[PDB]
Amino acid sequence: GDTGSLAGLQAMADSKYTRAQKKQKMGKIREMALKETALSVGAQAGLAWRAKIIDEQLNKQARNLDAIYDFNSLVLEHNILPPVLLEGRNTLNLADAQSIRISDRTYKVAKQAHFITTPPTWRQYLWMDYVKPEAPNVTLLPKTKAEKEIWCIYTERGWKNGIDQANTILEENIARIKEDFGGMILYRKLLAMNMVSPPYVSHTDLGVTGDGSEIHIDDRVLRITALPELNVNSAEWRAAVAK
Amino acid sequence: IIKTGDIMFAVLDTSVNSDEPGPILATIVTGKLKGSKLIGSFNLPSNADKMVITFNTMSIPGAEKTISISAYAIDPNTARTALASRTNHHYLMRYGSLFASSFLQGFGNAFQSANTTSTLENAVIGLATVGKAWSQQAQQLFNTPTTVEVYSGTGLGILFTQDVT
Amino acid sequence: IIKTGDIMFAVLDTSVNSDEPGPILATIVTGKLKGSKLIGSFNLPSNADKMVITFNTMSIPGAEKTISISAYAIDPNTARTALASRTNHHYLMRYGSLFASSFLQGFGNAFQSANTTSTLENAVIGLATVGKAWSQQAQQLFNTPTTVEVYSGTGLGILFTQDVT
Amino acid sequence: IIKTGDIMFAVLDTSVNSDEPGPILATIVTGKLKGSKLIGSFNLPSNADKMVITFNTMSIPGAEKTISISAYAIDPNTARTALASRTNHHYLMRYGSLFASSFLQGFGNAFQSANTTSTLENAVIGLATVGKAWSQQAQQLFNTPTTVEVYSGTGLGILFTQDVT
Amino acid sequence: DGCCSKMGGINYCDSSAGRLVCNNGFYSTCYCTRHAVMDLQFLMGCCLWHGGVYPQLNSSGLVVCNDGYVSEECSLQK
């Protein structure tokens, strides 16, 4: 007894608990492997089950995902993916003592704009990979009824843990696609604000080409010569106001 | 990196009598190694209080290497080193043969001895002479042990002995 | 490139008595090697509860090469090491010869001993003297083991021991 | 730094009979070293007064080191070196077989000697001749000692001998 | 069971449409060939929308895809 610990120590001076402790010492020394195996297999099974449930729930209502994540609306006129911009407000850094550096707002290019063939979808961002594991193997078995019951409850705890892991992974994917979409819409708003440069491209046309063996009847080569970037001078900045 | 002396498992698919040693392989079914096969051999103990398969040669798929982590066997779901087999194979055969040879010899000689105090004479004849030669041949053959035999569908546990990389 | 300790099939097509060991060939019937032939031999155990074929002389067609991968045998669809043959070939014959020689010896000596308390005398005579030399000759020739014999219409399963290229 | 001769706890999860020595490993669960485990072996004493495990190959996980601290074993919560197992395993079987073979010999000789002062004679016959061969065989086989066997669920204590780092 | 049940029965399979044709001249509701019009949305496997499964048998339980993305949920856990 550690609560009224002097009285508990006077009680543990009695010889009854001294020999009572040995026969429970073996039970408290021989149980961990069953516990850890139950935890591990519960983790695997719960993770798989919750992942399948999540995929079913995701694919149940796919239409509004395509409604909201229309990249094909945001593809530019020369079939160009717009770049990714990141913004920040109330910047403050402390390098060390006697040194504070502050700023109001800030901007940063994350992904440079590049060519595309097809607009992306949400499935590569958000689909959870599913594979059922059909390999149940038991190393050490719970041999008594109390061991089987605690095996069940540690399986239940592992089920909960796998549920937690699946939920965190799903929210991680949500965060990534939110970051990318916010970057593109921020770029569009800043170009509307005339803060960034428009991307500049050219096309060169070449006539009826090819040798005497094989021919191509035209050759138009398109190359982007100027990536979008911000202007460092603020004189060309136009504001906006609503009603 | 494998730590020196933890416990792994395998499932054995092939049976062998304990008479002629040879390569015997188990299928490592769990752990970091999948598709792994383990060949070794066996030894004949003097007493049947345990029986093991000595394992030495490990083959792991994927990469073409043959590491030499060698280990022993414990019984599945017992964590003991005995082998689940039968050992009462040749108690009764040699026991009954020797005892029948003895009883034959005794029958012929003592029912010859009690003659003073023709078919019964021929009983004495047959017992008195087929007891002795079968008795010496039975004591010649009495030393053959009862073999043990593993089975072709039993798993096993394997406790590590050294490190590998 | 063959993994160490995996199981392949072969089919044994010709039979041989286990008295003269020799090169015995099988045709490997499954796996990456097709049309391949293999010679090896056996060994005679003291107790005949299993019988195996050592298999090393491997010939593969396509190119004239002869690899020497050595491996042992298991019974397919049985996964045990015994030979499916007869083992009681020469027990009862020598048993009967010894016991008959004994009965002769006993007949002559005991029914001469019972003389105190023509044809019967000559029966004593004949069995008395033809028991002895036949009995010592029966113990002379009693030592021949019971032969086993592999069969010409049962295949075998070959489990690998080392790697080849 | 470990004090030269302190006490540690080790977890025994696998059993072995005291017939063939081998690398038997326990797992230290206390002290500064976590996840550490230690293999060793046992010895067969002449008398069954106690049975102990010697431990040599010590491994600390994480990093590739394998120290060789030698130690002995004590029974937990007894502070003694005995093993909790059985010791009356093979007294009674050999005692009964030997005394039965004796009683057969005695029955034949004394109940033949009491003949002067058919089926009863055959009883004398059977005991008379099957006593002696079983008597010499039992005197041959009496020499096997009683085996002990440790358990797969009782750990033990370890007292140190040398220093490591 | 009977695909052309309550009909004339199975006549033959059109492979240009991948469908069986009943003896009454109607397209059946069972397919015969693989190369027909399926409507399936649930898919198995992992390293999906990626480089696929990397073919090397790694010693570690972490399995990576060929495009470099790491799929720990396809992998085992610590």
| Contact of B102 with D108, CB cutoff 8 Å | no
What is the phi/psi pair of residue B71, to 5°? Answer: -155, 175
**Side-chain-facing half-sphere of B124: CA atoms under 13 Å:** 21
- Where do the DSSP E strands lie in A71-211? 80-81, 85-96, 99-109, 114-115, 200-206, 209-210
Tokens coding C80: 């045990």
Considering only the C-alpha atoms of chain E, give the largest distance between any 2 of them, rounded to a whole number of Å.
61
* Closest by CA position to B158, among listed B28, B22, B18, B25: B28
> What number of residues does chain C have?
165
* 8 A C-beta contact, residue D42 and residue D18: yes
CA distances E32 to A98, A227, D137, E14, Å, are 80, 53, 78, 8
Structural determination approach? cryo-EM
* Closest-CA residue of chain B to D40: B161
CA angle E69, E70, E72 (to 5 degrees): 155
Three-state SS string over chain C comes to CCCCCCEEEEEECCCEECCCCCCEEEEECCCCCCCCEEEEEECCCCCCCCCCEEEEEEEECCCCEEECCCEEEECCCCCCCCCCCCCCCCCHHHHHHHHHHHHHHHHHHHHHHCCCCCHHHHHHHHHHHHHHHHHHHHHHCCCCCCCCEECCCCCEEEECCCCCC
Nearest to B20 among C45, C107, C110 (CB): C45
d(CA C155, CA C10): 6
Measured between CA atoms, the residue of chain B closest to residue D108 is B106
Q: What is the dihedral of CA A23, A25, A30, A34, to 10 degrees?
A: 100
Nearest CA to A56 out of A178, A166, A179 is that of A166
Contact E75, E63 (CB under 8 A): yes
User: What distances in angstroms separate CA A8 from CA A19, A28, D77, one per listed residue?
Assistant: 16, 21, 21
The amino acid that residue D87 corresponds to is: T
Cβ distance B115 to C111 less than 8 Å, yes or no, reads: no
Tell me if B132 sits within 8 A of D133, measured CB to CB. Answer: no
Is residue B57 within 8 Å of B37, Cβ to Cβ? no
Q: How far is Cα A125 from Cα A123, in angstroms, rounded to an integer?
A: 5
Cα D67 from Cα D22, distance rounded (Å): 19
C-alpha distances in angstroms, B56 versus A8, B6, B24, B35, B158? 55, 16, 10, 17, 11
Measured CA to CA in angstroms, residue A107 lies from A89, A104, A242, B31 at distances of 9, 11, 24, 49
First to last CA, chain A: 73
| Pair D15, D86: CB distance under 8 Å | no
Are D130 and B102 in contact, with CB atoms under 8 Å apart? yes
Residue E74 CA to residue E41 CA, distance in Å, equals 19
Nearest to D162 by CA among D33, D57, D38, D70: D70
State how far the Cα of D48 lies from the Cα of A43, in Å rounded to an integer: 48
End-to-end CA gap in chain D: 5
Tell me which amino acid residue A93 is. N
Question: Distance (Å) from the C-alpha of residue D84 to the closest C-alpha of chain A?
Answer: 13
The count of C-alpha atoms lying within 13 angstroms of the C-alpha of D37, restricted to the half-sphere facing its C-beta, is 24
User: Of the candidates A128, A49, A31, A114, which has an alpha carbon nearest to the alpha carbon of residue A79?
Assistant: A114
Task: Give the H or E element holding residue A175.
Answer: helix A145-192
Dist. CA B23–CA C74, nearest whole Å: 10
| Chain A residue with Cα closest to B11 | A137
Q: Which helix H or strand E contains D125, and what residues bound it?
A: helix D119-141
Asked if D39 lies within 8 A of B161 by C-beta distance, the reply is yes
Tell me the Cα Rg of chain E: 21
Q: Is E9 on the interface with B (CB under 8 A)?
A: no
Q: Which residue of A has its CA nearest to D78?
A: A22
Buried b (16+ CB within 10 A) or exposed e, D111-133: bbeeeeeeeebeebbbbbbbbbb
Crossing angle, helix C92-113 and helix B92-113, to 10 degrees?
10
Task: Read off φ and ψ for residue A114, nearest 5 degrees.
Answer: -150, 175
Q: Which residues of B touch E60 (CB under 8 A)?
A: 32
Give the helix/strand (H/E) hosting A187.
Answer: helix A145-192
CB atoms within 10 A of CB C147: 15
Residues from chain E that touch A124, judged by Cβ atoms under 8 A, are 49-50
Contact partners, residue E29, CB within 8 Å, separation at least 6 = E3
Q: How far is D21 from chain A (nearest CA, A)?
A: 24
Residues sharing a CB contact under 8 Å with residue C109, sequence separation 6 or more, in sequence order? C128
Which two structure tokens, joined as six digits, stand for B98?
A: 């020797």
Q: Pick from D19, D54, D49: which is nearest to D149 by CA?
A: D19
Across C93-125, b (16+ Cβ under 10 Å) vs e yields ebeebbbbbbbbbbbbbbbeebeeeeeeeeebe
CA distance A82 to A185: 9
Interfacial residues of B (vs D; Cβ cutoff 8 Å): 1, 3-7, 45, 47, 49-50, 52, 71-72, 74, 78-82, 98-99, 102-103, 105-107, 110-111, 114, 117, 131, 135, 139, 142, 157, 159-161, 163
Residue E39 sits at the chain A interface (C-beta within 8 Å): no
Distance CA B79, CA D151 (A): 9
Contact A29, D11 (CB under 8 A): yes
Residue type, C4: T
Torsion angle of the four alpha carbons C66, C68, C72, C78, in this order, in degrees rounded to the nearest 10:
-30
* Torsion from C-alpha of C55, C60, C65, C66, nearest 10 degrees: 0
Q: Are E22 and E7 in contact (CB under 8 A)?
A: yes
Q: Does A29 touch chain D (CB under 8 A)?
A: yes
Which is nearest to C119 in space by CA: C127, C110, C129, C130? C127
Rounded CA separation D51/D43 (Å)? 8
Q: Check residue D114 and report its DSSP letter.
A: T
C155 in Cβ contact with C7 (< 8 Å): no
Breaks (C-N over 2.5 A) in chain B follow: 117
Q: Quick one: resolution in A?
A: 4.6
User: What tokens appear for E47 in the block?
Assistant: 């390293």
Residues 6+ apart with CB under 8 A from A14: none
Going from the C-alpha of B74 to that of each of B156, B158, C4, the distances in angstroms are 6, 6, 23
Q: Cβ(C154)–Cβ(C65) under 8 Å?
A: no
| Element holding A51 (H helix, E strand) | helix A32-60
Q: Give residue A205's identity as a one-letter amino acid code.
A: D
Contacts of D154 (CB under 8 A, 6+ apart): A26, D12, D76, D84
The residue whose two tokens read 């069972």 is E30
Nearest CA in chain A to E50: A124
> And the tokens for A197?
């440069």
